[PDB]
Design a protein around this ligand. Structure first.
Ligand SMILES: Nc1ncnc2c1ncn2[C@@H]1O[C@H](COP(=O)(O)OP(=O)(O)O)[C@@H](O)[C@H]1O
Ligand SMILES: [NH3+]Cc1ccccc1N1CCC(CO)CC1
Ligand SMILES: [Mg+2]
Ligand SMILES: [Mg+2]
Length: 261
């Protein structure tokens, strides 16, 4: 049904590995949306057809205020097009670059919105596996929305870029489950408060070392409550990481967040 002819294309919203994402408006309805463009030659070369299929099937069926909607797709012999909800206030990544660090209230609020969306995902046994600031978008009221389900799957499971958000079991090629998303949640909470992720390093090889050893320290300004939560999430043993419910009910979260479970 849908074809390129049905849309007017506007400015670039962002660039991805395969993805090149544009603002667009549907001609008959004037509906404003985002069009994620992937080149088939690059998809075929990388051999990532299967995860593109996953992205469409999993994201199109999820329904949650804190998850970005996917409406449909089409393709045209050189390109695939994913039709997405437009997020008008951009990425959390850009916001972090602008402010350098978030305060505790802004951080706890984002963590609550994230944990709500992840709780909904895990109840359907969907694990996201690529939670990071460039994949977190902001709606018209500044609410957080998880996007980019290009690495998502069903659990249990086995398995090019940054190691910074991945847990030890995943970077060691081992087996993993839902608890990978709780680790990434810990990494994010730290990066929000401090301005850089806790295992950041100059080379791949050494980042790998800091992650497998769980080697991180806190700057003085990080408070006791934040330290307690982050320390609970960044556990080497997956089974020792908390349930999302315990994250949403953590004293530091409840004291500082401006949104409910
Ligand atoms: N719906 C959207 N609204 C606004 N900006 C978006 C939207 N989707 C993607 N972007 C921008 O484009 C970038 C790449 O999108 P993404 O779907 O994450 O591609 P990739 O799978 O290649 O990472 C994002 O980091 C963001 O800057
Ligand atoms: N049919 C489009 C296409 C072209 C080239 C490579 C992969 C793909 N898909 C990804 C999306 C899938 C949704 O069903 C269909 C297969
Ligand atoms: Mg992305
Ligand atoms: Mg992707």
């Amino acid at each position: 049904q849908w074809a390129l002819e049905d849309f007017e294309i506007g400015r670039p919203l962002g660039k991805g590995k395969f993805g090149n994402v544009y603002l667009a408006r549907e001609k008959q309805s004037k509906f404003i949306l985002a069009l994620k463009v992937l080149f088939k030659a690059q998809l075929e070369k990388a051999g990532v057809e299967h995860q593109l299929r996953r992205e469409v099937e999993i994201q199109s069926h999820l329904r949650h205020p804190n998850i970005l909607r996917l409406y449909g797709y089409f393709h045209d012999a050189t390109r695939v097009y994913l039709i997405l909800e437009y997020a008008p206030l951009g990425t959390v990544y850009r916001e972090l670059q602008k402010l350098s660090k978030f305060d505790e209230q802004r951080t706890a609020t984002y963590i609550t919105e994230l944990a709500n969306a992840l709780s909904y995902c895990h109840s359907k046994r969907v694990i996201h596996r690529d939670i990071k600031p460039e994949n977190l978008l902001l709606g018209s009221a500044g609410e957080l929305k998880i996007a980019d389900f290009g690495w998502s799957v069903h659990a249990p499971s086995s398995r090019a870029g940054t190691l910074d958000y991945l847990p030890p079991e995943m970077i060691e090629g081992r087996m993993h489950d839902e608890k990978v998303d709780l680790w990434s949640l810990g990494v994010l909470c730290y990066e929000f408060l401090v301005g850089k992720p806790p295992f950041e390093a100059n080379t791949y090889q050494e980042t790998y070392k800091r992650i497998s050893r769980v080697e991180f320290t806190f700057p003085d300004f990080v408070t006791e409550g934040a330290r307690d939560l982050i320390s609970r999430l960044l556990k080497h043993n997956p089974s020792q990481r908390p349930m999302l419910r315990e994250v949403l009910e953590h004293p530091w979260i409840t004291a500082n967040s401006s949104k409910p479970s």
